[PDB]
Amino acid sequence: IRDDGYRLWGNRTLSSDSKWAFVTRVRTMDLVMDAILAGHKWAVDRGITKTYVKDVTEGLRAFMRDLKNQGAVINFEVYADPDLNSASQLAQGKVYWNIRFTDVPPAENPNFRVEVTDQWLTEVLDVA
């Protein structure tokens, strides 16, 4: 829109699912993880120690926290989903964590409500 192809217009994206209505939502949810993986590269091998679970849940809380600091998200919550982490899964290498967080809602549709009254009329003009 706007003069001679001034600018883009539309944060919305083709999605049947309303939750992923904003490209901001999708892009955040994707690139957040790009930053996580490019940083937890060390975590994808290595002999599982007693402190492996904690090394990772803290490493996550580092990258995640940094993103919060620079605006990227608004609060978050990382931990190591217990109802899944088991001896069997661990012997087979696997292990799970949760990373529930909130993404910056892009301000859209500011509703400037306006009333042209005659309230401030006597306050000026008449005599004064």
Add this chain to the structure above:
Amino acid sequence: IRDDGYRLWGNRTLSSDSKWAFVTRVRTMDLVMDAILAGHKWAVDRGITKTYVKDVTEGLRAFMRDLKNQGAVINFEVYADPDLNSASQLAQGKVYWNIRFTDVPPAENPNFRVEVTDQWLTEVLDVA
């Protein structure tokens, strides 16, 4: 009247109302306002400001004063009738002023009273 249609004769006019007996009265009361309006043209629009009332009451005192200077009237009095100027009327554009003035009474009916006496008789003639 007078020889071979010398001149006109009669300042009086057809009027049931004695106040408007003189054409001088009517013509003055009319053309005075013609001069006022042709001069306060600017005053018939424009966003009413705090000083609108004063701009006009002074503009009136200018044209009115000038007319006094060149004889047209004899004193006058302009102001902005308070018991009418209100927030309601102003919101609806309207506004009021008074322009009470006096008009030049045309000298008519000079009464030359004359007595042919014999007072200044001895003052001359006899002896001297």
